Amino acid sequence: KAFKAQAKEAQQLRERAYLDPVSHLGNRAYYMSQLSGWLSESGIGGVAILQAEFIKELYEEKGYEAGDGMVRELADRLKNSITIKDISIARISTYEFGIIMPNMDETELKIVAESIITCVDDINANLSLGVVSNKRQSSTTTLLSLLDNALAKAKSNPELNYGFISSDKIILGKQQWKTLVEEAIHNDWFTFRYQAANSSWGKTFHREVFSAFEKDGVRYTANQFLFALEQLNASHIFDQYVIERVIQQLEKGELTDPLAINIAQGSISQPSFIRWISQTLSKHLSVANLLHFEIPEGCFVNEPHYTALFCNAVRNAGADFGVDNYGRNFQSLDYINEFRPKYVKLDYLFTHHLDDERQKFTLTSISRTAHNLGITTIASRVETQTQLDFLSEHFIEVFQGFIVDKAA
Ligand SMILES: [Mg+2]
């Protein structure tokens, strides 16, 4: 099949496999997959369960038309009223909704809770809302238990609008992360890990860079502050420091493999950064061949102008780029044709928890779309050999994760 036929097939399968037809939100499996990936990777943020009792009544009293129409109306309201980065909005039941808000503190979660209540108020007992503030990585069983208690508390005392639970640890503000990151950038406190992405034979396609730094014997990883830098607009300050450092180790002459650097969405949106990247890569043209710039899919779909500027400047200096979280935005896959990325890193959603028939088709279709263009398909966070062999039957060619990090 040609691209447009293949891409449209991939977008159809992705919609039928992970989206609720009526609400057009994520379905039950989507919510289940999103929850497991966020909890196992960071678990920092908030999760909420909205029990739209008024939708339940319409289904039992007025029929499917009334309930369906109200589900769609509330779904569009939530989808438009809660614009939070990397948020997950899913319909986990006929009248229940699950929301995942990564990297959000209790004060921001409680604001979103009143916003979800305001959505229901605009669309005329009515609801029960349970909000859980999560600080550390835990099991999906433990978090779902906390949500179940958050709901119980909202019903136990309807003197409040929503039940709130926190588990457990006084966190850091956004400006506190900035001064903390700027200090690590000041003294070169940052440590770098290189996770290899290999083919089934062990051929290293590239190594994704992971950053961390220490203070007081406490270790902070990039995903603990990357959002605060973006929300403070200062994400370019960190991405420039990483690129500078990665160029040094490349100029030590030892690393023969390309290095993948994650570029923040808020970094490419800044014209100063795209200028800074073209000057840096011009004065380090020797090692640009070993530079892979991992662009999130959000930049291609929502900032295609700056991304085209960044991609053009990157490829005219000998470097290349790839798509990170490929397919995650549930939008058009056209940009694969217009940008022709060197690789696509499939999002966690389309690679894990493939328990249903249609999920596997979506993987093959979404992967063929890039494969049939000569674009290397990569699956990350691959933790098992049986997982690797399974993904290789669905047009995944490069693998990254625990199975690669255990070998030798
Ligand atoms: Mg990445």
Author numbering: 221 to 344, 353 to 396, 399 to 638
From the primary publication:
LapG-containing operons also harbor a gene that encodes a conserved c-di-GMP receptor, LapD. LapD is composed of a periplasmic Cache domain, flanked by single-transmembrane helices, followed in the cytoplasm by a juxtamembrane HAMP domain with a signaling (or S) helix that leads into a GGDEF and EAL domain module. However, in LapD, both domains are enzymatically inactive, yet the EAL domain retains its ability to bind c-di-GMP. Through detailed structure-function studies, a mechanism for the regulation of LapG via LapD has emerged: LapD adopts an autoinhibited conformation that is characterized by the GGDEF domain functioning as a lid atop the EAL domain, which occludes the c-di-GMP binding site.
To gain unbiased insight into the structure and regulation of V. cholerae LapD, we determined a crystal structure of its cytoplasmic domains comprising the S helix followed by GGDEF and EAL domains in the absence of c-di-GMP. Crystals diffracted X rays to a maximum resolution of 2.7 Å. The electron density maps resolved the S helix with the final refined model spanning residues 221 to 638 (top). Despite the low sequence identity, the structures of V. cholerae and P. fluorescens LapD superimpose with an overall root mean square deviation (RMSD) of 1.7 Å, indicating structural conservation of their apo states. The major difference pertains to a rigid body rotation of the GGDEF domain of approximately 12° relative to the EAL domain. However, the autoinhibitory S helix-EAL domain interaction responsible for P. fluorescens LapD autoinhibition at low cellular c-di-GMP levels is well preserved in the structure of the V. cholerae ortholog. More specifically, residues F223, A227, and R234 of the S helix (corresponding to F222, A226, and R233 of P. fluorescens LapD) nestle against a partially hydrophobic interface on the EAL domain. As seen with P. fluorescens LapD, this contact places the GGDEF domain atop the putative c-di-GMP binding site on the EAL domain. Based on structural work, we show that the Vibrio cholerae LapD ortholog adopts a similar autoinhibited conformation utilizing the same intramolecular interfaces as determined for the related P. fluorescens LapD, despite low sequence conservation.
